[PDB]
Design a protein around this motif. Structure first.
Motif, mmCIF file in Angstrom:
data_model
loop_
_atom_site.group_PDB
_atom_site.id
_atom_site.type_symbol
_atom_site.label_atom_id
_atom_site.label_comp_id
_atom_site.label_asym_id
_atom_site.label_seq_id
_atom_site.Cartn_x
_atom_site.Cartn_y
_atom_site.Cartn_z
ATOM 1 N N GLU A 170 2.066 -0.310 3.658
ATOM 2 C CA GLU A 170 1.625 -2.054 4.964
ATOM 3 C C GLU A 170 1.785 -3.101 3.477
ATOM 4 O O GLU A 170 1.368 -2.723 2.233
ATOM 5 C CB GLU A 170 0.050 -2.254 5.046
ATOM 6 C CG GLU A 170 0.619 -0.724 6.566
ATOM 7 C CD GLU A 170 -1.127 -0.571 7.025
ATOM 8 O OE1 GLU A 170 -2.267 -0.743 6.467
ATOM 9 O OE2 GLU A 170 -1.708 0.039 7.839
ATOM 10 N N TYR A 183 0.225 3.616 1.952
ATOM 11 C CA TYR A 183 1.590 3.336 3.724
ATOM 12 C C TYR A 183 2.390 3.256 3.472
ATOM 13 O O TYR A 183 3.567 3.778 4.082
ATOM 14 C CB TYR A 183 0.185 3.735 4.479
ATOM 15 C CG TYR A 183 0.459 4.013 5.769
ATOM 16 C CD1 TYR A 183 1.374 4.685 6.318
ATOM 17 C CD2 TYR A 183 0.053 3.113 6.938
ATOM 18 C CE1 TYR A 183 1.711 5.380 7.348
ATOM 19 C CE2 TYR A 183 0.459 3.047 7.652
ATOM 20 C CZ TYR A 183 0.971 4.437 8.270
ATOM 21 O OH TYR A 183 1.215 4.668 9.466
ATOM 22 N N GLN A 196 9.680 -0.310 7.086
ATOM 23 C CA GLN A 196 9.659 0.893 8.373
ATOM 24 C C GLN A 196 10.367 2.273 7.344
ATOM 25 O O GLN A 196 11.420 1.833 6.951
ATOM 26 C CB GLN A 196 11.051 0.142 8.770
ATOM 27 C CG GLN A 196 11.268 1.193 10.529
ATOM 28 C CD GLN A 196 10.730 1.248 10.942
ATOM 29 O OE1 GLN A 196 10.008 0.118 11.460
ATOM 30 N NE2 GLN A 196 10.723 2.719 11.803
ATOM 31 N N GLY A 197 9.721 3.164 7.492
ATOM 32 C CA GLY A 197 9.802 4.239 7.129
ATOM 33 C C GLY A 197 9.484 4.484 5.974
ATOM 34 O O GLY A 197 10.314 5.444 5.475
ATOM 35 N N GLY A 198 8.630 3.534 5.807
ATOM 36 C CA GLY A 198 8.121 3.628 4.187
ATOM 37 C C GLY A 198 6.871 5.222 3.901
ATOM 38 O O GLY A 198 5.843 4.358 5.017
ATOM 39 N N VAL A 199 6.735 5.824 3.691
ATOM 40 C CA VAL A 199 5.734 6.969 2.927
ATOM 41 C C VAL A 199 5.160 7.082 0.837
ATOM 42 O O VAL A 199 6.614 7.265 0.804
ATOM 43 C CB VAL A 199 5.942 7.946 3.622
ATOM 44 C CG1 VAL A 199 7.199 8.447 3.590
ATOM 45 C CG2 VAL A 199 4.784 8.926 3.288
ATOM 46 N N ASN A 221 1.150 -1.460 -0.129
ATOM 47 C CA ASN A 221 0.309 0.261 0.073
ATOM 48 C C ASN A 221 1.329 1.237 0.513
ATOM 49 O O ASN A 221 2.275 1.305 0.547
ATOM 50 C CB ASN A 221 -1.292 0.292 1.108
ATOM 51 C CG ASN A 221 -1.704 1.497 1.032
ATOM 52 O OD1 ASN A 221 -1.824 1.782 0.267
ATOM 53 N ND2 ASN A 221 -2.351 1.571 2.130
ATOM 54 N N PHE A 235 13.972 7.105 -1.681
ATOM 55 C CA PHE A 235 14.097 6.201 -0.691
ATOM 56 C C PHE A 235 14.300 4.728 -1.267
ATOM 57 O O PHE A 235 13.244 4.479 -2.074
ATOM 58 C CB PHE A 235 14.324 6.353 0.803
ATOM 59 C CG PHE A 235 14.434 7.672 1.176
ATOM 60 C CD1 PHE A 235 14.212 9.002 0.956
ATOM 61 C CD2 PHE A 235 15.444 7.351 2.532
ATOM 62 C CE1 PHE A 235 14.660 10.155 1.974
ATOM 63 C CE2 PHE A 235 16.399 8.155 2.817
ATOM 64 C CZ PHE A 235 16.245 9.001 2.813
ATOM 65 N N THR A 247 14.086 11.444 -6.934
ATOM 66 C CA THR A 247 12.875 11.642 -7.629
ATOM 67 C C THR A 247 12.214 10.285 -7.257
ATOM 68 O O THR A 247 13.170 8.898 -6.911
ATOM 69 C CB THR A 247 13.365 11.719 -8.830
ATOM 70 O OG1 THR A 247 14.270 10.913 -9.808
ATOM 71 C CG2 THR A 247 13.690 13.040 -9.085
ATOM 72 N N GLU A 262 8.539 7.551 -3.445
ATOM 73 C CA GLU A 262 8.710 8.373 -3.959
ATOM 74 C C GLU A 262 9.600 9.744 -3.839
ATOM 75 O O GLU A 262 10.188 10.507 -4.783
ATOM 76 C CB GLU A 262 6.884 9.578 -3.595
ATOM 77 C CG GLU A 262 5.983 8.990 -4.892
ATOM 78 C CD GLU A 262 4.658 9.804 -4.752
ATOM 79 O OE1 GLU A 262 4.445 10.053 -3.453
ATOM 80 O OE2 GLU A 262 3.570 9.401 -4.936
ATOM 81 N N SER A 263 10.030 9.810 -2.626
ATOM 82 C CA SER A 263 11.244 10.915 -2.202
ATOM 83 C C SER A 263 12.688 10.032 -2.814
ATOM 84 O O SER A 263 13.195 10.661 -2.162
ATOM 85 C CB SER A 263 10.988 10.640 -0.738
ATOM 86 O OG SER A 263 10.964 9.245 -0.056
ATOM 87 N N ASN A 312 14.183 0.786 0.499
ATOM 88 C CA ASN A 312 14.053 0.204 1.895
ATOM 89 C C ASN A 312 14.256 -1.661 1.051
ATOM 90 O O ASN A 312 13.974 -1.811 1.183
ATOM 91 C CB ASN A 312 13.261 0.462 2.693
ATOM 92 C CG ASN A 312 13.745 1.658 3.599
ATOM 93 O OD1 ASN A 312 14.243 2.875 3.331
ATOM 94 N ND2 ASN A 312 12.689 1.731 4.151
ATOM 95 N N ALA A 329 19.176 1.165 3.601
ATOM 96 C CA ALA A 329 18.338 2.416 3.146
ATOM 97 C C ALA A 329 19.020 3.114 1.366
ATOM 98 O O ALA A 329 19.434 4.651 1.548
ATOM 99 C CB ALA A 329 17.778 3.060 4.265
#
Lengths: 41, 422, 102, 49, 235, 121, 50
Positions: free
Chosen positions: E74, E72, E93-96, E70, E133, E157, E130-131, E135, E151
């Motif tokens: 998950e 978010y 972990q630290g995912g957005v 997802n 990163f 981008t 999107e940032s 993982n 990471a």
């Protein structure tokens, strides 16, 4: 004064014999960490 | 070449001749104890008197300094001049001075060494003639004020060009700039020759080794990206490590352990070079502290090996040498400690060595395997050799005890080895 | 009251006279305040003093807020000691650099 | 079972190691005073692991 | 969409399945040949990407796992051999703003198998964002919150491509937002290669990446319509 | 993490982190506890987002004291790493603030999330 | 007291316009967007800061 005619001086001898000190990557199956051997086609 | 350039070479050769009064004032002003105004007023008898007392104090600390009292700190040395000497005499004087700088290298923290060396600076102008030896012996005191005084009165040789900024500067030279001196390949050869002389003379001390190690270790890091320049470092610094290992001093051996370990991580080497490194590490292994550091070094180097034969059995001579210095009980203790470094590859090579050469330790193999988890392929190699043992060697209670251990852990992989082999 | 102040204020806490004069007359502001007499700032030299004051003030707010707002603080200074180590490391690499070309 | 499966198992068996970069041993100069060689060597290992 | 292999356990037969992305967390699984609708998988939030992982059981037996993430962060893992029932849940972990997910080191779309015995489990999992990163997780070593091994943050981008080499020794992460945003990451060290790509390497807006099943060829498409080919001499 | 109170749920955290990302593009975001402390003093902060796993948590615990004094909504999100990536920086961010602007293009979404934080308080 | 309020809002509006200009000076990729009303704003590209 000099003639050639576990031994401590083993490490020194192998350095004299060998000129290239990096293990050949052709035989190894694991690629190097930071150097990539890549050619464009 | 222009006439000025040729005359420049003439001036350097006659630097300490003291032709006129102005030249005398410059030469006699240079001092390690006194400012320029006070230094020029002094006399050789005044300087020699103080130095003689200092040498006595150093003599009490170390008897070896008493020898120079006959040669360099003699009353007859007051009337001795180097410019009037013949070449054989000057060479012969330089050997005595170089020996003195080695002994004084470790006592620069003591005040008397600064007074005793003032005699040589004033009488023999070592800061002008023997400038490289003086700098090398006092290189690890770079943060000390004494090194600052040396830089003020000394003309830097070409190989010490980076220190020119810090000549007569409030800030002492930074630790980062010492990497730059050792980064140069020519300087490493010079320092190697100097460090070799200390080992021949057993004049090495811990502070020297520590500073020497950090500069050597950092030089690898600065060249880590440049693989070509790492290759040029291998002939030099591994040759240094061989000399350090040969030294009976344990502190020298531990420094060699530090130097070798960083190289193996920085640059992968032939297994032949790695195996030769063990032969040198183990040949002169007597000190207990050296014994502890050596085992960590031996485990680490095999970790770096990443080619076929990575976990092959040690040679016959190599295995016999290792067992004598590290009996089977010691390695079991090494594996027993929970903080053991990664050593699976070495144990895999060691385990296959036992089966090939010493059947009596086959029971020890069972204990070793329980203590450490070996990787999937490493277990497969051990299973493969033990299968050959059953065909050749007589069946034993310990030998079957090894198979059933593999039956208990990952039974299926045991079948695959058997299916591929018989 | 100190705990609720941002790190920038703690840097220039004791130099209000120079700060508000400079702010109103469009001139440069002070950079040490009362923290100038800390031992770490003394060890720095040249422009590094301003940098260490910024670093130390930021860590001071971290260590101070823990003192003020911690319900179950141990009287050990563990947050202060680890905060101190970071500033010393920052000072060492900050002081190690040489502007003059070698 | 095939030879390639043996080779692939060797690759997976390999594990990560901390590479050496330029800014790894610079801090050793800071604390190189009045320390025994053995303690210094352990610190080198600690950074290398 | 993506195409995978599903083994019908109760007959031991193997067939292909086409996986599609639905509107509301929905993954629709079709029969590759007959086109029949077999099962559907649902996750909460907006589905962003999914990937397939194979887990061998015994001789001639394997199970297909659908890994869906997802936005978010998950992650759901469905067992497609058991009507697509969830078997594990965890969070990046630290995912957005997650954008892609991929597995490597075993069989997959980029390194498909030729027979049942060649099915292998993937030991790596990478999750883009999107940032920029990425993982990276070591699948071989289960918890609701797993810590990532690395990471990676060289790209600034959105990650639009995540692909491993067939042996799982190189991870190629690329972004279509800016030019020359392609990096090769060595595994298990997770250290980005330095010598290549250079400033002079022509890549453009990387929009497609492919690794050859064998021979170590790398093909990189771009917005200009040019597919540039590179060979890794190690292979 | 009992001190982190109130802590937003998974559904709400996505909505908050979405606004934080949009605000970053429009430069309507102040990153860091110290900047968040300032905005409260200047009274230009719509609401404050904080990270629960920040260790020690007390370094950001002064912000609730200011926020309740100034009548500013505030909420905790579970991860500081996720907040930092949402902010659009390379470092973990423990606290952030949305600067007030009635002419912003994301005015509606900020107030939408603002109400949910108010209800959640 | 009302005159104090009017001065405060005027200073607030003035500060906001200066701050908006300062964001343009900083590094990044920005596009000028103009609405039908003529109001100009800058939208920054979604690039993470190194």
């Amino acid at each position: 004064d000099e003639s050639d005619s576990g031994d401590i001086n083993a490490l020194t001898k192998i350095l004299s014999t060998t000129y290239n000190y990096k293990d050949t990557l052709s035989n190894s199956k694991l690629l190097p960490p930071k150097k990539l051997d890549i050619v464009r086609l | 070449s222009s006439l000025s350039d040729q005359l420049a070479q003439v001036a350097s050769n006659n630097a300490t001749v003291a032709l006129d009064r102005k030249r005398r004032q410059k030469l006699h002003s240079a001092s390690l104890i006194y400012n320029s105004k006070t230094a020029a007023t002094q006399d050789y008898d005044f300087i020699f008197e103080n130095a003689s007392k200092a040498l006595e104090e150093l003599s009490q600390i170390e008897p070896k300094f008493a020898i120079f009292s006959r040669t360099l700190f003699s009353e007859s040395s007051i009337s001795l001049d180097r410019n009037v000497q013949t070449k054989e005499e000057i060479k012969d004087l330089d050997n005595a001075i170089n020996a003195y700088l080695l002994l004084a290298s470790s006592k620069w923290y003591l005040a008397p060494t600064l007074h005793a060396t003032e005699w040589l600076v004033r009488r023999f102008q070592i800061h002008v003639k023997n400038t490289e030896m003086l700098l090398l012996s006092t290189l690890n005191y770079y943060q000390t004020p004494v090194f600052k005084r040396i830089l003020s009165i000394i003309k830097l040789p070409p190989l010490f060009n980076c220190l020119s900024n810090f000549v007569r500067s409030e800030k002492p030279p930074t630790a980062l700039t010492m990497i730059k001196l050792f980064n140069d390949m020519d300087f490493l050869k010079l320092y190697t020759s100097y460090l070799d002389q200390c080992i021949k003379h057993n004049a090495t001390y811990t502070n020297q080794l520590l500073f020497t190690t950090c500069c050597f270790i950092n030089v690898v890091a600065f060249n880590s990206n440049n693989d070509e320049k790492l290759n040029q470092l291998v002939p030099i610094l591994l040759e240094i490590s061989a000399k350090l290992l040969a030294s009976k001093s344990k502190d020298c051996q531990i420094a060699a352990h530090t130097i070798l370990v960083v190289f193996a991580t920085a640059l992968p080497l032939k297994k032949t070079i790695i195996l030769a490194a063990m032969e040198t590490i183990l040949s002169n292994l007597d000190a207990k502290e050296a014994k502890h550091s050596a085992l960590l070094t031996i485990c680490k180097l095999f970790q770096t090996l990443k080619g076929q034969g990575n976990v092959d059995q040690l040679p016959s001579k190599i295995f016999k040498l290792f067992d004598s210095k590290f009996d089977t009980v010691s390695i079991l203790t090494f594996l027993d400690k929970e903080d053991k470094p990664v050593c699976d590859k070495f144990i895999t090579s060691y385990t296959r060595s036992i089966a090939r050469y010493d059947r009596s330790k086959l029971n020890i193999i069972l204990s070793l395997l329980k203590k450490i988890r070996l990787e999937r392929y490493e277990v497969r190699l051990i299973i493969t050799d033990l299968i050959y043992l059953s065909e050749i060697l007589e069946d034993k209670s310990q030998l079957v005890e090894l198979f059933e251990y593999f039956i208990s852990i990952n039974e299926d992989l045991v079948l695959k080895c058997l299916k591929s082999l018989g | 009251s100190l705990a609720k102040s941002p790190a920038s204020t703690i840097q220039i806490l004791g130099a209000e006279k120079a700060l508000f004069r400079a702010l109103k007359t469009k001139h440069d502001t002070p950079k040490y305040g009362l923290l100038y007499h800390a031992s770490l700032v003394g060890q720095a030299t040249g422009k590094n003093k301003g940098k260490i004051a910024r670093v130390l003030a930021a860590k001071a707010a971290v260590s101070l807020r823990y003192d003020a707002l911690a319900e179950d603080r141990d009287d050990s200074g563990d947050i202060g000691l680890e905060s101190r180590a970071k500033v010393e490391n920052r000072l060492s690499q900050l002081e190690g650099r040489d502007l003059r070309t070698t | 079972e095939d030879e390639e499966d043996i080779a692939l198992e060797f690759i997976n068996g390999e594990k990560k190691d901390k590479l050496v970069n330029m800014n790894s041993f610079t801090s050793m100069f800071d604390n190189i005073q009045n320390v025994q060689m053995d303690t210094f060597f352990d610190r080198v290992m600690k950074v290398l692991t | 969409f993506k195409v995978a292999h599903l083994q019908n356990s109760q007959t031991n037969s193997v067939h292909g399945i086409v996986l599609l992305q639905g509107n509301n967390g929905w993954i629709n699984i079709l029969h590759s040949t007959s086109g029949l609708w077999l099962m559907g998988c649902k996750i909460e939030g907006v589905i962003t990407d999914f990937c397939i992982d194979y887990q061998p059981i015994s001789r001639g037996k394997f199970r297909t796992i659908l890994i869906a993430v997802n936005a978010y962060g998950e992650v759901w893992e469905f067992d497609l051999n058991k009507n697509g029932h969830v078997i594990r849940r965890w969070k990046d972990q630290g995912g957005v703003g997650i954008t892609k997910i991929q597995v490597g080191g075993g069989t997959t779309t980029t390194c498909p198998a030729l027979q049942i015995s060649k099915i292998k489990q993937n030991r790596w999992l990478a999750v883009g964002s999107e940032s920029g990163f990425v993982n990276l997780y070591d699948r071989n070593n289960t918890s609701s919150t797993p810590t990532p091994v690395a990471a990676l943050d060289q790209l600034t981008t959105t990650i639009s491509n995540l692909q491993f080499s067939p042996d799982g020794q190189i991870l190629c992460m690329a972004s279509r937002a800016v030019k020359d945003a392609l990096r090769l990451v060595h595994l298990p060290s997770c250290s980005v290669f330095s010598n290549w790509p250079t400033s002079g390497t022509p890549l453009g807006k990387v929009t497609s990446v492919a690794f050859s099943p064998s021979g170590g060829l790398l093909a990189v498409g771009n917005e200009q319509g040019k597919v540039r080919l590179w060979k890794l001499n190690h292979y | 993490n009992p001190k982190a109170f109130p802590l937003a749920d998974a559904a709400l955290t996505q909505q908050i982190l979405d606004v934080v990302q949009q605000a970053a593009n429009l430069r309507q975001l102040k990153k860091g506890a110290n900047e968040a402390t300032k905005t409260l003093n200047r009274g230009i902060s719509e609401f404050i987002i904080m990270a629960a796993d920040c260790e020690p948590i007390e370094i950001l615990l002064h912000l609730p004291l200011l926020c309740e004094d100034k009548n500013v909504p505030y909420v905790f999100v579970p991860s500081r790493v996720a907040l930092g990536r949402a902010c659009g920086v390379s470092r973990p961010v423990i606290a952030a603030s949305i600067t007030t602007n009635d002419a912003s293009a994301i005015k509606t979404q900020i107030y939408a999330v603002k109400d949910k934080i108010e209800t959640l308080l | 007291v009302k005159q104090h309020l009017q001065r405060e809002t005027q200073l607030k509006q003035v500060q906001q316009r200066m701050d908006a200009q300062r964001e343009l000076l900083k590094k990044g990729s920005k596009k000028k967007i103009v609405d039908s009303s003529g109001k100009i704003s800058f939208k920054w590209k979604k690039q993470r800061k190194r």
